[PDB]
Amino acid sequence: PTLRWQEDPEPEDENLYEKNPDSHGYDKDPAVDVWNMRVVFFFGFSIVLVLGSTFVAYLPDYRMQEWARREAERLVKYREAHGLPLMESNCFDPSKIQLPED
């Protein structure tokens, strides 16, 4: 014989269609919804996505990659011309060592 409440039946469902069939995602203000569609496709795709594609498609030599390609080509031709085998092992100088004796 008591209620513990005073409020409306929750919720009050409002369909976002059926007042604007020409509406996009949010509220029935017909101008700013078109403004949102325009800004999300122009300032979100048309100036961001394809420009980012052209930006990341080519840029300087990332991790000095093709620099290392041409450097390795010149170094292999250099070491083939000077008779020594390519990739001299023991990259640090074996004369430049001070071993702990035993």
Partner 1 sequence: MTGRQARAPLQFLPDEARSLPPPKLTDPRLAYIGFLGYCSGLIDNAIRRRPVLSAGLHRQFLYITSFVFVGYYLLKRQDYMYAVRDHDMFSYIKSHPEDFPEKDKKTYREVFEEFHPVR
Partner 2 sequence: ARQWQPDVEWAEQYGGAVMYPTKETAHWKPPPWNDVDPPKDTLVSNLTLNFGPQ
Partner 3 sequence: LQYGPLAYILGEKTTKKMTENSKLITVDGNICSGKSKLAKEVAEKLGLKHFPEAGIHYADSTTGDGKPLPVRFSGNCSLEKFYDDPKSNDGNSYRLQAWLYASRLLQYADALEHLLSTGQGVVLERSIYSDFVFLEAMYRQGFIRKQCVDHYNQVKKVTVCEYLPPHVVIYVDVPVSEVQSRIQKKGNPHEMKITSAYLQDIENVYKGTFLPEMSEKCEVLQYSAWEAEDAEKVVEDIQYLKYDKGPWLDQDDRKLHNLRMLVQDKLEVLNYTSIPVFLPEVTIGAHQSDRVFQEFTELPGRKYRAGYNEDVGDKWIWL
Half-sphere exposure of 58 (CA within 13 A, CB side): 1
C-beta of residue 65 within 8 angstroms of C-beta of residue 72: no
Q: Which is nearer to partner 2, 5 or 58 (CB)?
A: 5
Work out what residue 63 binds among partner 3, partner 2, partner 1, none; the CB cut-off runs from 5 to 8 Å by kind. Answer: none
Which span (4-12, 36-44, 53-61, 93-101) binds partner 3, by CB under 8 A?
A: 4-12
Neighbouring residues of 86: CB distance < 8 A, sequence distance ≥ 6: 75, 76, 79, 80
- Per CB under 8 A, does 9 bind partner 2? no
- Per CB under 8 A, does 60 bind partner 2? no
Alpha-carbon distance 84 to 76, whole Å?
10
C-beta of residue 59 within 8 angstroms of C-beta of residue 50: no
Q: Site residues for partner 3, window 9-68 (CB under 8 A)?
A: 10
Least gap, CB of 12 to partner 2 (angstroms): 8
Query: Which residues form the interface with partner 3 (CB under 8 A)?
Result: 1-8, 10
Query: Which residues form the interface with partner 2 (CB under 8 A)?
Result: 4, 10-11
